[PDB]
RNA sequence: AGCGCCGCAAUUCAUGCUGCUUGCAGCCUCUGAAUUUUGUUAAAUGAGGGUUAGUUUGACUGUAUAAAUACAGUCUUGCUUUCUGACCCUGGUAGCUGCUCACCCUGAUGCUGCUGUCAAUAGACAGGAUAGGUGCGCUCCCAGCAAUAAGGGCGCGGAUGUACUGCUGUAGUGGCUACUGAAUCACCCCCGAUCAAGGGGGAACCCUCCAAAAGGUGGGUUGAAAGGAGAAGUCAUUUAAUAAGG
DNA sequence: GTGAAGGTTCTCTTCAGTATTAATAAGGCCACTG
DNA sequence: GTGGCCTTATTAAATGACTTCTCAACCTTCAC
């Protein structure tokens, strides 16, 4: 689970502006935090198929959002994935 | 069916178990995986599928350069040989499956072409129905194997009248019929064949044998990829998911010892039977078995000692032990795998080799087969093969002095027919065939006797355990179980009851039905009905008769047939195959199954 | 009988880019047919209700388009033009609308569902994926009887000025 | 209500019984078949989870016999399963982590359903398979909930180029890991073993036997079955995720 | 020098497949007429 | 009794089943 402080820090860091809470860039940043933590869990917990179910959802959610961003603008898309460290 | 398996736990100190586990998991199973990969890429692979046969030596040839590859080099000679046998039998299995499926697809595709309605047969013959009926009466009078003979007659007879007459004659089960064709029952029967062709076509898209990766390196690298990389499209992400859901293989492939003397038996000073394997004699394993099997493991030592005392003038061709499989059974709980899992030896024996009379049966079977071989076989190593065969043929004459038990004698005119059904798994009729009289019926309830309550237990547990799995799946709970072992128990109880009744009436044989593939018949029948009832509504079609289709997929007619065949062979009762009639009750089906198998003796 | 009458049905002319879902909906309304009714009339059964949602596993086959081309007098080649051409990826769920096209021709265009389409080149407008006044998503094109948003009743022709 | 199962009762009957004439004719006690009712103080079924290298289901040889098997002697090992008993539980402490929820309507193979102290709110404590409904049981039905089947309705905020997102708490409910609680058994107790390991001591009932009012040698017994296994492919069902399908 | 590990061959699979006798069905809600 | 509705695909897993294949043996060599 994700703390409100880490959540709000993600919001502030990826916001387009101070009241943006839901742009696709903020959404993929939130999902990237979740995917990173859950990958570390599943590397240690291969039999946690319940948690693995969540990963496949989260990876798909981010895949759809990044594909949406990429055809709004490749400049914003490339900058965003570079910040998040996604190849 | 005189080959059976007996098993024992193998016990040894930890360093022996660890050394064997590492040989199996780190070298032998990776070698098997590599052989499966290379064999599936071989340029002759596509012609092996057409022959349905693997070359006798191609796995051995592929393994030779791998025996000194740093990935695989550390193994005894018999472990390489075991890996070869594993891989060779896998493809012998898979190529045989694909070959038969292809023949089924070709056979039914021809039938779909020659299945024409009388409205179509009128046009395609150009003759009135009475005219083709007469021509079918002539062609039947010549073809008098009848089915195959008509299928032979069809192909090269390009004369559309005779060709249509054969089509009409085959539509009716190789016979004349006066009655009119019900056009909707024909259209349904045509549709069944299309579904069967489609389902055969889909089954022929089987995967190549997948192997056992025990490291699961592909899973972890895919996890790192899918979490840090953008998927190029949906199909890459789907392939990632398909890998991430794939479950890890825990256990290596077992070892196979096709030379019975590669298991060397001994008794330790604490009096326990012990075994070691060729190439691993430093690892002594202690035999821990039930007394109900101990007499076999004692026999393995006595057979070994007999041939040593005779300075190898006996043949191991008559050793009661045939081969061994060395298996790790999955342990519950946690530990290092050589501690967690339990090492188990499975020995094939031929039950006839227990007695002296049965050994004489095997000796003649061996002698005839080897005398045939030596005559037909006639290089230096091929001449050495002849000399080994001639040594076997000489040495099988030396007796092991085994227990004498006179062979079963059954009356040729007394048969037991066993009717198999979805509702009543077995029903038997003892028939005196020259008298044409039933000596005894038994129902399923009389066969099970006091065990009959197990049959309602099975139905009740199959319902209950399916529903508990359904509930557990939604929670991702691992606690998913089923009644397969109870079902196996019931089929073995029935098999013993049937054979005991056969012995009691001195039946010469047990008659079993040629059911064919009941599941593909039922599945294509129900689909053809459902497509009429739910046109354009696939989920309605799949809901239709769902529980009947499930019941037919659970019907264990093969396991019951196999259990009967094994028990009859262990008492020397002949098994015969007959055709079960569709008419009548299970009792009448069993009687007419028995009597038809008697009349089919030619 | 009426003498010298040929057995007949109410027809509709398909518009130049009209989607199959929109077209079948008009034909059904012109004949007060339920979605199940047209499928029974063509004999393909429940498939029509599936096509009207753009659920195209499998795609409309040659057999079924030729079957529908028996009750609808539009030929199967023209019915295939109501669908994505081969290999053009389409999305069924987000139903989309240009509005400025709807003021010129009251049909849903199948190209508004293509994964490659986002602007109307004719109008130079970003096509809508929900009602711009009240954010309600558009219903399946078979159900566009009123030509307006089902929630706030704004006509699709007025949503033209709420684009791009 | 429906469906499955269970027995009950009834009819007909042969795989049952009776007879001389051994292929037929009666009958329905026994042992079974055909599915026909019916739920009764009946007789049968009965599904919360777990607990033994448990016992019996063996091998060989001699003797007997019509097989079936039976008796006597010698040997015996612990594998993989199916039942019947008996016993124990309703778990604990830290971590990691999924899913769910703005709100409303409908209600799914959804969730929950025991006893009795206490107790207005809240659940706790002590019992415990008697666990909602019927003879028993269900995904059916009843009652409460339902966000965690599907759908539908409809807020403000972000976003609005097809992606969607927030309203979400010491929250509800799953999974995984580590450590840990009870039975860890086959007549009972105690001390040990668990890749090997057994030892000690008792209670009932029956044999065997001093010549005997009385207890006591030498032993026996204290629930049964089944077995052909590995490897590879496939089908079916269900669950989860993804996609809108070349 | 008896025991352990390791070598060696075993052929061809143009053959097998394709037909019946088929069972009452196996669909369930809603609303709406007749 | 008529009529409307009910989406369909792939891949992985568990369970229950089915099918196929396999089930040598004598000899040589080097090690006390
Ligand atoms: Mg989408
Ligand atoms: Zn436009
Ligand atoms: Zn609106």
CSV table of N, CA and C (backbone and C1' of nucleotides) in Angstrom, one decimal, chain B residues 5 7 9 199 206-207 210 212 241 270 272-273 288-289 291-293 339 354 441 443 445-446 456-457 460 464 467 470 473 475 477 485 492 496 546 549 553 567 570 587, chain D residues 5 15 32-33 46-47 49 58 60 68 76-83 109 139 174-175 195-197 226-239 241-242:
chain,number,residue,atom,x,y,z
B,5,UNK,N,4.0,-52.2,-12.1
B,5,UNK,CA,5.0,-51.5,-11.3
B,5,UNK,C,4.8,-51.8,-9.8
B,7,UNK,N,6.8,-50.4,-6.1
B,7,UNK,CA,7.6,-49.2,-5.7
B,7,UNK,C,8.1,-49.3,-4.3
B,9,UNK,N,10.2,-46.6,-1.2
B,9,UNK,CA,11.1,-45.5,-0.8
B,9,UNK,C,12.5,-45.9,-0.8
B,199,UNK,N,-12.6,-29.8,-35.0
B,199,UNK,CA,-12.0,-30.1,-33.8
B,199,UNK,C,-10.7,-31.0,-33.9
B,206,UNK,N,-1.2,-28.8,-31.9
B,206,UNK,CA,-0.6,-29.1,-30.6
B,206,UNK,C,0.8,-28.5,-30.5
B,207,UNK,N,1.2,-28.1,-29.3
B,207,UNK,CA,2.6,-27.6,-29.0
B,207,UNK,C,3.6,-28.7,-29.1
B,210,UNK,N,7.4,-29.4,-24.1
B,210,UNK,CA,7.9,-28.2,-23.5
B,210,UNK,C,9.2,-28.3,-22.6
B,212,UNK,N,11.3,-29.1,-18.9
B,212,UNK,CA,11.2,-28.7,-17.5
B,212,UNK,C,12.4,-27.8,-17.1
B,241,UNK,N,2.5,-11.6,-20.3
B,241,UNK,CA,1.6,-12.1,-19.3
B,241,UNK,C,1.6,-13.7,-19.4
B,270,UNK,N,22.6,-54.9,8.7
B,270,UNK,CA,21.4,-54.7,9.5
B,270,UNK,C,20.2,-55.4,8.8
B,272,UNK,N,18.8,-55.1,5.8
B,272,UNK,CA,17.9,-54.4,4.9
B,272,UNK,C,18.4,-54.6,3.4
B,273,UNK,N,17.5,-54.9,2.5
B,273,UNK,CA,17.8,-54.8,1.1
B,273,UNK,C,18.3,-53.4,0.7
B,288,UNK,N,13.0,-49.3,1.5
B,288,UNK,CA,11.9,-49.2,2.5
B,288,UNK,C,10.6,-49.4,1.8
B,289,UNK,N,10.0,-50.6,2.0
B,289,UNK,CA,8.9,-51.0,1.2
B,289,UNK,C,7.8,-51.6,2.1
B,291,UNK,N,5.5,-54.8,3.0
B,291,UNK,CA,5.6,-56.2,2.9
B,291,UNK,C,4.9,-56.8,1.7
B,292,UNK,N,3.8,-56.2,1.4
B,292,UNK,CA,3.0,-56.6,0.2
B,292,UNK,C,3.8,-56.5,-1.1
B,293,UNK,N,4.9,-55.7,-1.1
B,293,UNK,CA,5.9,-55.7,-2.2
B,293,UNK,C,7.2,-56.4,-1.9
B,339,UNK,N,16.3,-33.0,0.7
B,339,UNK,CA,15.7,-33.3,2.0
B,339,UNK,C,14.2,-33.3,1.9
B,354,UNK,N,7.1,-64.5,-12.1
B,354,UNK,CA,7.1,-65.0,-10.7
B,354,UNK,C,7.1,-66.5,-10.7
B,441,UNK,N,-25.9,-62.9,-14.2
B,441,UNK,CA,-25.7,-61.4,-14.3
B,441,UNK,C,-25.2,-61.0,-12.9
B,443,UNK,N,-25.1,-56.8,-11.2
B,443,UNK,CA,-25.2,-55.4,-11.4
B,443,UNK,C,-23.9,-54.7,-10.8
B,445,UNK,N,-24.0,-52.8,-8.3
B,445,UNK,CA,-24.1,-52.9,-6.9
B,445,UNK,C,-23.6,-54.3,-6.4
B,446,UNK,N,-23.9,-55.4,-7.1
B,446,UNK,CA,-23.4,-56.7,-6.7
B,446,UNK,C,-21.9,-56.8,-6.9
B,456,UNK,N,-21.8,-43.8,-4.5
B,456,UNK,CA,-22.4,-42.5,-4.2
B,456,UNK,C,-21.4,-41.5,-3.5
B,457,UNK,N,-20.5,-42.0,-2.8
B,457,UNK,CA,-19.4,-41.1,-2.3
B,457,UNK,C,-18.7,-40.4,-3.4
B,460,UNK,N,-20.9,-37.6,-4.9
B,460,UNK,CA,-21.0,-36.6,-3.9
B,460,UNK,C,-19.7,-35.8,-3.8
B,464,UNK,N,-19.0,-31.8,-4.6
B,464,UNK,CA,-18.5,-31.0,-3.5
B,464,UNK,C,-17.1,-30.4,-3.7
B,467,UNK,N,-17.1,-27.6,-6.4
B,467,UNK,CA,-17.6,-26.4,-5.9
B,467,UNK,C,-16.6,-25.7,-4.9
B,470,UNK,N,-14.0,-24.1,-7.1
B,470,UNK,CA,-14.5,-22.9,-7.7
B,470,UNK,C,-14.5,-21.8,-6.7
B,473,UNK,N,-10.7,-20.8,-6.1
B,473,UNK,CA,-10.1,-20.1,-7.2
B,473,UNK,C,-10.3,-18.6,-7.1
B,475,UNK,N,-10.6,-16.9,-4.5
B,475,UNK,CA,-9.7,-16.3,-3.5
B,475,UNK,C,-8.2,-16.5,-3.8
B,477,UNK,N,-6.8,-19.2,-3.5
B,477,UNK,CA,-6.3,-20.2,-2.5
B,477,UNK,C,-5.8,-21.4,-3.2
B,485,UNK,N,-8.3,-40.2,-6.9
B,485,UNK,CA,-7.9,-41.4,-6.2
B,485,UNK,C,-9.0,-42.3,-5.8
B,492,UNK,N,-10.5,-50.2,-9.7
B,492,UNK,CA,-9.8,-51.4,-9.3
B,492,UNK,C,-10.6,-52.4,-8.5
B,496,UNK,N,-11.2,-56.3,-10.0
B,496,UNK,CA,-11.1,-57.5,-9.2
B,496,UNK,C,-12.4,-58.3,-9.1
B,546,UNK,N,-24.2,-28.7,-20.6
B,546,UNK,CA,-22.9,-28.6,-20.1
B,546,UNK,C,-22.5,-29.7,-19.1
B,549,UNK,N,-21.9,-33.1,-20.9
B,549,UNK,CA,-20.5,-33.0,-21.4
B,549,UNK,C,-19.5,-33.2,-20.4
B,553,UNK,N,-16.8,-36.3,-20.0
B,553,UNK,CA,-15.4,-36.1,-19.8
B,553,UNK,C,-14.8,-36.7,-18.5
B,567,UNK,N,-5.7,-57.1,-14.3
B,567,UNK,CA,-6.1,-58.2,-13.4
B,567,UNK,C,-6.3,-59.5,-14.2
B,570,UNK,N,-2.9,-61.1,-15.0
B,570,UNK,CA,-2.3,-61.7,-13.8
B,570,UNK,C,-3.0,-63.0,-13.4
B,587,UNK,N,-27.7,-55.1,-18.8
B,587,UNK,CA,-27.6,-56.5,-18.7
B,587,UNK,C,-27.7,-57.1,-20.2
D,5,C,P,-29.9,-39.3,-8.0
D,5,C,O5',-29.5,-39.5,-6.5
D,5,C,C5',-28.1,-39.7,-6.1
D,5,C,C4',-28.0,-39.5,-4.6
D,5,C,C3',-28.7,-40.6,-3.8
D,5,C,O3',-28.0,-41.8,-3.8
D,5,C,C1',-29.2,-38.5,-2.9
D,15,U,P,-32.3,-64.6,-15.5
D,15,U,O5',-31.2,-64.3,-14.3
D,15,U,C5',-30.0,-65.1,-14.2
D,15,U,C4',-29.3,-64.9,-12.9
D,15,U,C3',-30.2,-65.1,-11.7
D,15,U,O3',-29.4,-65.8,-10.7
D,15,U,C1',-29.2,-63.0,-11.5
D,32,G,P,-28.2,-58.2,-2.0
D,32,G,O5',-28.2,-58.3,-3.6
D,32,G,C5',-28.8,-57.4,-4.4
D,32,G,C4',-29.1,-57.9,-5.8
D,32,G,C3',-29.9,-56.9,-6.6
D,32,G,O3',-29.1,-56.0,-7.3
D,32,G,C1',-30.9,-59.0,-6.7
D,33,A,P,-29.7,-54.6,-7.8
D,33,A,O5',-30.6,-55.0,-9.0
D,33,A,C5',-30.0,-55.3,-10.2
D,33,A,C4',-31.1,-55.5,-11.3
D,33,A,C3',-32.0,-54.3,-11.5
D,33,A,O3',-31.3,-53.3,-12.2
D,33,A,C1',-33.3,-56.2,-11.4
D,46,G,P,-23.1,-41.2,4.0
D,46,G,O5',-23.3,-39.7,4.4
D,46,G,C5',-23.2,-38.7,3.4
D,46,G,C4',-23.7,-37.3,4.0
D,46,G,C3',-22.9,-36.8,5.2
D,46,G,O3',-21.8,-36.0,4.7
D,46,G,C1',-25.2,-36.8,5.8
D,47,A,P,-20.4,-36.5,4.3
D,47,A,O5',-19.6,-35.1,4.1
D,47,A,C5',-18.8,-34.6,5.1
D,47,A,C4',-18.8,-33.1,5.1
D,47,A,C3',-20.1,-32.5,5.5
D,47,A,O3',-19.9,-31.2,6.1
D,47,A,C1',-19.8,-32.0,3.2
D,49,G,P,-14.1,-29.6,5.2
D,49,G,O5',-12.8,-29.3,5.9
D,49,G,C5',-11.9,-28.2,5.5
D,49,G,C4',-10.9,-27.8,6.5
D,49,G,C3',-9.9,-29.0,6.8
D,49,G,O3',-8.9,-29.1,5.9
D,49,G,C1',-10.7,-28.0,8.8
D,58,G,P,-4.1,-60.3,0.7
D,58,G,O5',-2.9,-60.6,1.7
D,58,G,C5',-1.9,-61.5,1.4
D,58,G,C4',-0.6,-60.9,1.0
D,58,G,C3',0.5,-61.9,0.6
D,58,G,O3',0.5,-62.1,-0.7
D,58,G,C1',1.2,-60.5,2.4
D,60,C,P,4.2,-67.3,-3.2
D,60,C,O5',5.2,-68.3,-2.5
D,60,C,C5',6.5,-68.3,-2.8
D,60,C,C4',7.3,-69.1,-1.8
D,60,C,C3',6.8,-70.5,-1.6
D,60,C,O3',7.4,-71.4,-2.6
D,60,C,C1',7.1,-69.5,0.5
D,68,A,P,-9.1,-71.8,-6.2
D,68,A,O5',-10.2,-71.0,-5.3
D,68,A,C5',-11.0,-70.0,-5.9
D,68,A,C4',-12.2,-69.7,-5.0
D,68,A,C3',-11.9,-69.4,-3.5
D,68,A,O3',-11.7,-68.0,-3.3
D,68,A,C1',-13.4,-71.2,-3.6
D,76,U,P,12.1,-62.3,9.4
D,76,U,O5',11.1,-61.4,8.6
D,76,U,C5',11.4,-60.7,7.3
D,76,U,C4',10.3,-60.1,6.8
D,76,U,C3',9.6,-59.0,7.7
D,76,U,O3',10.4,-57.8,7.7
D,76,U,C1',7.9,-60.3,6.7
D,77,U,P,10.2,-56.7,8.9
D,77,U,O5',8.9,-56.0,8.4
D,77,U,C5',8.6,-54.6,8.8
D,77,U,C4',8.5,-53.7,7.6
D,77,U,C3',7.7,-54.3,6.4
D,77,U,O3',6.8,-53.3,5.9
D,77,U,C1',9.8,-53.7,5.6
D,78,G,P,5.3,-53.2,6.5
D,78,G,O5',5.2,-51.6,6.8
D,78,G,C5',5.4,-50.8,5.7
D,78,G,C4',5.9,-49.4,6.1
D,78,G,C3',6.6,-48.7,4.9
D,78,G,O3',6.5,-47.3,5.1
D,78,G,C1',8.1,-49.0,6.7
D,79,C,P,5.3,-46.4,4.4
D,79,C,O5',5.6,-46.6,2.8
D,79,C,C5',6.8,-46.1,2.2
D,79,C,C4',6.7,-46.2,0.7
D,79,C,C3',5.5,-45.6,0.2
D,79,C,O3',5.6,-44.2,0.0
D,79,C,C1',5.6,-47.7,-0.7
D,80,U,P,4.4,-43.2,0.4
D,80,U,O5',3.4,-43.4,-0.8
D,80,U,C5',3.7,-42.9,-2.1
D,80,U,C4',2.6,-43.3,-3.0
D,80,U,C3',1.2,-42.9,-2.5
D,80,U,O3',1.0,-41.5,-2.7
D,80,U,C1',1.2,-45.1,-3.2
D,81,U,P,-0.2,-40.9,-1.8
D,81,U,O5',-1.5,-41.6,-2.5
D,81,U,C5',-2.7,-41.6,-1.7
D,81,U,C4',-3.6,-42.6,-2.4
D,81,U,C3',-4.9,-42.7,-1.7
D,81,U,O3',-5.8,-41.7,-2.0
D,81,U,C1',-4.1,-44.9,-2.2
D,82,U,P,-7.0,-41.3,-1.0
D,82,U,O5',-8.0,-42.6,-1.0
D,82,U,C5',-8.8,-42.9,-2.2
D,82,U,C4',-9.7,-43.9,-1.8
D,82,U,C3',-10.5,-43.6,-0.6
D,82,U,O3',-11.6,-42.7,-0.8
D,82,U,C1',-9.8,-45.8,-0.4
D,83,C,P,-12.2,-41.9,0.4
D,83,C,O5',-13.1,-43.0,1.1
D,83,C,C5',-13.3,-43.0,2.5
D,83,C,C4',-13.8,-44.4,2.9
D,83,C,C3',-14.2,-44.5,4.3
D,83,C,O3',-15.5,-43.9,4.6
D,83,C,C1',-12.9,-46.3,3.8
D,109,U,P,-24.3,-16.4,-11.6
D,109,U,O5',-24.0,-17.7,-10.7
D,109,U,C5',-24.9,-18.1,-9.7
D,109,U,C4',-24.2,-19.0,-8.7
D,109,U,C3',-23.0,-18.4,-8.0
D,109,U,O3',-23.1,-18.7,-6.6
D,109,U,C1',-22.4,-20.5,-8.9
D,139,U,P,-24.8,-23.9,-2.4
D,139,U,O5',-25.2,-23.2,-3.8
D,139,U,C5',-25.0,-21.8,-4.0
D,139,U,C4',-25.2,-21.5,-5.5
D,139,U,C3',-26.5,-22.0,-6.0
D,139,U,O3',-27.0,-21.2,-7.1
D,139,U,C1',-24.8,-23.1,-7.2
D,174,G,P,-11.7,-13.4,4.0
D,174,G,O5',-11.0,-13.5,2.6
D,174,G,C5',-9.7,-14.0,2.5
D,174,G,C4',-9.1,-13.8,1.1
D,174,G,C3',-7.7,-14.4,1.0
D,174,G,O3',-7.7,-15.8,0.8
D,174,G,C1',-7.8,-12.2,0.1
D,175,G,P,-6.7,-16.7,1.5
D,175,G,O5',-5.3,-16.4,0.7
D,175,G,C5',-5.1,-16.8,-0.6
D,175,G,C4',-3.9,-16.1,-1.2
D,175,G,C3',-2.6,-16.5,-0.5
D,175,G,O3',-2.1,-17.7,-1.0
D,175,G,C1',-2.7,-14.1,-0.8
D,195,C,P,13.1,-38.8,8.3
D,195,C,O5',14.5,-39.5,8.4
D,195,C,C5',14.6,-40.9,8.4
D,195,C,C4',15.7,-41.4,7.5
D,195,C,C3',17.1,-40.8,7.8
D,195,C,O3',18.1,-41.8,7.6
D,195,C,C1',16.5,-40.3,5.6
D,196,A,P,18.8,-42.6,8.8
D,196,A,O5',17.6,-43.3,9.6
D,196,A,C5',17.4,-43.1,11.0
D,196,A,C4',16.4,-44.0,11.6
D,196,A,C3',16.5,-45.5,11.2
D,196,A,O3',16.1,-46.3,12.2
D,196,A,C1',14.4,-44.6,10.6
D,197,A,P,17.2,-47.1,13.1
D,197,A,O5',16.3,-47.6,14.4
D,197,A,C5',15.6,-48.8,14.4
D,197,A,C4',14.4,-48.8,15.2
D,197,A,C3',13.2,-48.1,14.6
D,197,A,O3',12.0,-48.5,15.2
D,197,A,C1',13.9,-46.9,16.5
D,226,A,P,-8.8,-56.3,-1.4
D,226,A,O5',-8.4,-55.1,-2.3
D,226,A,C5',-9.2,-54.4,-3.2
D,226,A,C4',-8.5,-53.2,-3.7
D,226,A,C3',-7.2,-53.6,-4.4
D,226,A,O3',-7.4,-54.2,-5.6
D,226,A,C1',-7.0,-51.6,-3.1
D,227,G,P,-6.2,-55.2,-6.1
D,227,G,O5',-5.1,-54.2,-6.6
D,227,G,C5',-5.2,-53.4,-7.8
D,227,G,C4',-4.1,-52.4,-7.8
D,227,G,C3',-2.8,-53.0,-8.1
D,227,G,O3',-2.6,-53.4,-9.4
D,227,G,C1',-2.7,-51.3,-6.4
D,228,G,P,-1.4,-54.2,-10.0
D,228,G,O5',-0.6,-53.0,-10.8
D,228,G,C5',0.5,-52.4,-10.2
D,228,G,C4',1.0,-51.2,-11.0
D,228,G,C3',0.0,-50.0,-11.0
D,228,G,O3',0.8,-48.9,-10.6
D,228,G,C1',1.0,-50.4,-13.2
D,229,A,P,0.2,-47.7,-9.8
D,229,A,O5',1.1,-46.4,-10.3
D,229,A,C5',2.4,-46.3,-9.8
D,229,A,C4',3.4,-46.1,-10.9
D,229,A,C3',3.3,-44.8,-11.7
D,229,A,O3',3.6,-43.7,-10.9
D,229,A,C1',4.0,-46.6,-13.1
D,230,G,P,3.3,-42.2,-11.5
D,230,G,O5',4.5,-42.0,-12.5
D,230,G,C5',5.9,-41.9,-12.1
D,230,G,C4',6.8,-41.9,-13.2
D,230,G,C3',6.6,-40.8,-14.2
D,230,G,O3',7.2,-39.6,-13.8
D,230,G,C1',6.7,-42.8,-15.4
D,231,A,P,6.6,-38.2,-14.2
D,231,A,O5',6.9,-38.2,-15.8
D,231,A,C5',8.2,-38.0,-16.3
D,231,A,C4',8.1,-38.1,-17.8
D,231,A,C3',7.2,-37.1,-18.5
D,231,A,O3',7.7,-35.8,-18.6
D,231,A,C1',6.9,-39.3,-19.4
D,232,A,P,6.8,-34.6,-18.6
D,232,A,O5',6.2,-34.6,-20.1
D,232,A,C5',7.0,-34.4,-21.2
D,232,A,C4',6.3,-34.8,-22.4
D,232,A,C3',5.0,-34.0,-22.7
D,232,A,O3',5.3,-32.7,-23.2
D,232,A,C1',4.6,-36.3,-23.0
D,233,G,P,4.2,-31.7,-23.4
D,233,G,O5',3.5,-32.2,-24.8
D,233,G,C5',2.6,-31.5,-25.4
D,233,G,C4',1.6,-32.4,-26.1
D,233,G,C3',0.1,-32.0,-26.0
D,233,G,O3',-0.2,-30.9,-26.8
D,233,G,C1',0.3,-34.3,-25.6
D,234,U,P,-1.1,-29.7,-26.3
D,234,U,O5',-2.5,-30.4,-26.3
D,234,U,C5',-3.1,-30.9,-27.5
D,234,U,C4',-4.3,-31.8,-27.3
D,234,U,C3',-5.4,-31.1,-26.5
D,234,U,O3',-6.2,-30.3,-27.4
D,234,U,C1',-5.0,-33.2,-25.5
D,235,C,P,-7.0,-29.1,-26.8
D,235,C,O5',-8.4,-29.8,-26.3
D,235,C,C5',-9.3,-30.5,-27.1
D,235,C,C4',-10.2,-31.3,-26.2
D,235,C,C3',-11.0,-30.5,-25.3
D,235,C,O3',-12.1,-29.9,-25.9
D,235,C,C1',-10.1,-32.3,-24.1
D,236,A,P,-12.7,-28.5,-25.4
D,236,A,O5',-13.4,-28.9,-24.0
D,236,A,C5',-14.6,-29.7,-24.0
D,236,A,C4',-14.9,-30.1,-22.5
D,236,A,C3',-15.0,-28.8,-21.6
D,236,A,O3',-16.2,-28.2,-21.8
D,236,A,C1',-13.7,-30.5,-20.6
D,237,U,P,-16.3,-26.6,-21.4
D,237,U,O5',-16.4,-26.6,-19.9
D,237,U,C5',-17.4,-27.2,-19.1
D,237,U,C4',-17.0,-27.2,-17.6
D,237,U,C3',-16.6,-25.9,-17.0
D,237,U,O3',-17.8,-25.1,-16.7
D,237,U,C1',-15.0,-27.4,-16.4
D,238,U,P,-17.8,-23.6,-16.9
D,238,U,O5',-16.9,-23.0,-15.7
D,238,U,C5',-17.4,-23.1,-14.4
D,238,U,C4',-16.2,-23.0,-13.4
D,238,U,C3',-15.5,-21.6,-13.5
D,238,U,O3',-16.2,-20.6,-12.9
D,238,U,C1',-13.9,-23.3,-13.5
D,239,U,P,-16.0,-19.1,-13.3
D,239,U,O5',-14.6,-18.7,-12.6
D,239,U,C5',-14.4,-18.7,-11.3
D,239,U,C4',-12.9,-18.5,-11.0
D,239,U,C3',-12.4,-17.2,-11.7
D,239,U,O3',-12.7,-16.1,-10.9
D,239,U,C1',-11.0,-19.0,-12.2
D,241,A,P,-9.2,-10.3,-13.0
D,241,A,O5',-8.1,-10.1,-14.1
D,241,A,C5',-6.8,-9.6,-13.9
D,241,A,C4',-5.9,-9.9,-15.0
D,241,A,C3',-6.3,-9.2,-16.3
D,241,A,O3',-6.0,-7.8,-16.2
D,241,A,C1',-5.8,-11.4,-16.8
D,242,U,P,-6.8,-6.8,-17.1
D,242,U,O5',-6.3,-7.1,-18.6
D,242,U,C5',-5.0,-7.0,-19.0
D,242,U,C4',-4.8,-7.6,-20.3
D,242,U,C3',-5.6,-7.0,-21.4
D,242,U,O3',-5.0,-5.8,-21.9
D,242,U,C1',-5.8,-9.3,-21.5
